[PDB]
Amino acid sequence: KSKLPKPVQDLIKMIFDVESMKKAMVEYEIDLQKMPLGKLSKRQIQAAYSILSEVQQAVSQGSSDSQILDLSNRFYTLIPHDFGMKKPPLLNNADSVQAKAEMLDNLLDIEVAYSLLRGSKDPIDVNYEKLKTDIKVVDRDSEEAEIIRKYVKNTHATTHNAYDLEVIDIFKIEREGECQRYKPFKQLHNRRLLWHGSRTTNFAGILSQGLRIAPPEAPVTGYMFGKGIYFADMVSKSANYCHTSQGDPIGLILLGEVALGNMYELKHASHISKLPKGKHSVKGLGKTTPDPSANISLDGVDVPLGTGISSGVNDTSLLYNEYIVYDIAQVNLKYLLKLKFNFKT
Numbered sequence: 023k024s025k026l027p028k029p030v031q032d033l034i035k036m037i038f039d040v041e042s043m044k045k046a047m048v049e050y051e052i053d054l055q056k057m058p059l060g061k062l063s064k065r066q067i068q069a070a071y072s073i074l075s076e077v078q079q080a081v082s083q084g085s086s087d088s089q090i091l092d093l094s095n096r097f098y099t100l101i102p103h104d105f106g107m108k109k110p111p112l113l114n115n116a117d118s119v120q121a122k123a124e125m126l127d128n129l130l131d132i133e134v135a136y137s138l139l140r141g142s143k144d145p146i147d148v149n150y151e152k153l154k155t156d157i158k159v160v161d162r163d164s165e166e167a168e169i170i171r172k173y174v175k176n177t178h179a180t181t182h183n184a185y186d187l188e189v190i191d192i193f194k195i196e197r198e199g200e201c202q203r204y205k206p207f208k209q210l211h212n213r214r215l216l217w218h219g220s221r222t223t224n225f226a227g228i229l230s231q232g233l234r235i236a237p238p239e240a241p242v243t244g245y246m247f248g249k250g251i252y253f254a255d256m257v258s259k260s261a262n263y264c265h266t267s268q269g270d271p272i273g274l275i276l277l278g279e280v281a282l283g284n285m286y287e288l289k290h291a292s293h294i295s296k297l298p299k300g301k302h303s304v305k306g307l308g309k310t311t312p313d314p315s316a317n318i319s320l321d322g323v324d325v326p327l328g329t330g331i332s333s334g335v336n337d338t339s340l341l342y343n344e345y346i347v348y349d350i351a352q353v354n355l356k357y358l359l360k361l362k363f364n365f366k367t
């Protein structure tokens with residue numbers, strides 16, 4: 023009965039895949055009986071973030087093993103885990119705290135996906151409408167597809183040699199309310215078409231609610247430029263955040279129009295609470311940048327699809343550029359790509 027094109031139906035099945043959600047939770051060693059998908063709650067996850075912030079503070083402060091163990095046990099009480107024969111890993115380093123924070127980020131979007139899914143017509147059409155997003159297939163033979171394929175081909179980083187990328191499908195997307203929300207930023211200068219990678223299990227949340235900023239209660243660990251929305255001009259830097267594997271080599275990646283305006287240019291980590299007055303974004307400066315002479319205009323937006331060349335910058339923490347905005351209204355999502363990851367083994 024569903025009149026949606028086959029590629030769009032396949033996308034809906036992929037994003038609302040309950041088996042992918044359960045597999046993710048098993049990998050995280052979550053107790054699926056004590057915290058089923060339907061029992062995930064914002065208030066409990068909020069409280070879990072706060073505890074992880076206390077753990078992060080305890081670890082860097084060099085607190086006693088007693089107070090670290092206490093906080094570690096409090097986290098596992100809020101978010102039940104099942105380690106089987108193995109005892110529960112002690113949360114006593116920054117990497118472990120960041121891994122649990124990123125698990126919570128993914129769990130929240132899985133909760134959104136499951137709540138939508140269980141919230142006459144073909145089930146595929148019903149679930150499509152719940153995304154509150156217009157999704158159209160971009161024709162393979164179109165100049166539009168040629169530009170996007172070239173962006174993918176040209177901006178694969180030399181140091182990301184674990185996989186090759188193949189574009190399966192290109193979708194043009196329009197989130198309900200996003201045009202009205204973006205309107206004020208639409209006439210800002212320096213609008214750029216940039217990559218945003220995420221786990222497939224996040225995309226129901228991303229399409230229904232848009233790209234969002236980490237809450238205050240989330241720990242600061244791994245936010246190089248503070249709590250904002252991060253984008254790449256190199257497809258492979260973003261593609262890495264799809265967290266695809268040989269077992270599941272199909273990923274989803276966004277092209278967003280980002281209203282960057284006056285960029286605060288940084289070479290090193292700075293946890294931005296407030297931009298300098300007159301700045302609209304941060305650019306992390308990479309050693310390698312898309313060749314600016316190959317910059318193209320797609321529907322009034324700059325597409326940096328040039329091959330990676332040396333920037334001017336040797337004295338930087340970053341191999342590749344990154345772009346951060348601190349207002350959700352500065353992003354207009356344009357395309358969603360289904361990518362095949364061909365791992366080299």
Ligand SMILES: CNCc1ccc(-c2[nH]c3cc(F)cc4c3c2CCNC4=O)cc1
Binds near residue numbers: 217260
């Ligand atoms: C949430 N834990 C800390 C954290 C995790 C991931 C990111 C991040 N940095 C990026 C740079 C970039 F150029 C592109 C991306 C990211 C991300 C994740 C979002 N997606 C990206 O493509 C930033 C902070």
